[PDB]
């Protein structure tokens, strides 16, 4: 049993992996756990998602962590979401964003493996960054404008 | 395999549960089968974990000329509306306003034995922040004299909406 470590990009487009023990054809959208047998003692491979530095994979969806300031959360925010093929899409938020809020960007996920012309979604997942400290001056004003 | 649902309070102090079960029994005629109720008594010890198994030998069904089957209870944590169990720790969700998170607040932490412990926060509280209250958890089952911790876990509640005049002001005081 041998682990086959595939990046998100390789799941998205599909690829050829030449293994030096042997050629494996990774079909687009294939999910961690997919087994790829060889007659050559039967050497069986198993598909594993390599960690990605932009997205967390969730089936055929990908999650994009958006770290925004509290100021943006409360007052208005544009997230320029990166795509799997390296463009960005501007998504404009005019309402209050809450900690952990998600927003679907439909069709911007990975191809579904059985129907690869169809894609999952890209899911923005908000992390709201609080200030490290508030000066007394600011505290006073926050007390006037925010609900108890 | 039957579920034995036990409250956090019952795990905290221990308890004696009495479970009414019904089992099948071959009648004296060897033909017909009856259904009868039996009440089994289970002592739940301080700190027992979910998954703990309690076996009542030969207290299950008998539809045959042999020794009746077994009943196995599996301890399950009954959902609690105030705390979440985390091993020997209990987690306490503390829902506070954005105002309290930024400006300071006191959390009156309820305990398993029904006190509150006031805990005062002067610094910014972040979404998801935890604060430990040592020793206010559940008894460690192997050393029931010792206890886990009570953990405060913050949920910060944002305003639904913010008027333009408030936005103008928050833009002046909150860092970019």
From Swiss-Prot, chain A:
List every position bearing Phosphothreonine. 115
Give induction info.
Answer: By heat shock.
Q: Which residues form a coiled coil?
A: none
Q: Where in the cell is it found?
A: Cytoplasm; Nucleus; Nucleus, Nucleolus
Self-association state and partner proteins as the record states = Interacts with DNAJC3. Interacts with HSF1 (via transactivation domain); this interaction results in the inhibition of heat shock- and HSF1-induced transcriptional activity during the attenuation and recovery phase period of the heat shock response. Interacts with BAG3.
Annotated function: Interacts with HSP70 and can stimulate its ATPase activity. Stimulates the association between HSC70 and HIP. Negatively regulates heat shock-induced HSF1 transcriptional activity during the attenuation and recovery phase period of the heat shock response. Stimulates ATP hydrolysis and the folding of unfolded proteins mediated by HSPA1A/B (in vitro).
Its recorded name reads DnaJ homolog subfamily B member 1
What fragment of the whole protein does this chain represent? Answer: 165 to 340 of 340
């Amino acid at each position: 049993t041998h682990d086959l470590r595939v990046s998100l990009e390789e799941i998205y487009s599909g690829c050829t992996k030449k293994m030096k023990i042997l050629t494996i054809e990774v079909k687009k959208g294939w999910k961690e756990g997919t087994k790829i047998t060889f007659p050559k003692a039967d050497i069986v491979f198993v598909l594993k998602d390599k960690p990605h530095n932009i997205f967390k994979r969730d089936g055929s969806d990908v999650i994009y962590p958006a770290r925004i300031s509290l100021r943006e959360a409360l007052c208005g925010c544009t997230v320029n979401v990166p795509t799997l093929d390296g463009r960005t899409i501007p998504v404009v938020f005019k309402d209050v964003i809450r900690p952990g809020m998600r927003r679907k960007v439909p069709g911007e996920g990975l191809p579904l493996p059985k129907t690869p012309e169809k894609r999952g979604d890209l899911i923005i997942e908000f992390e709201v960054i609080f200030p490290e400290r508030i000066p007394q001056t600011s505290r006073t004003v926050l007390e006037q404008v925010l609900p108890i």
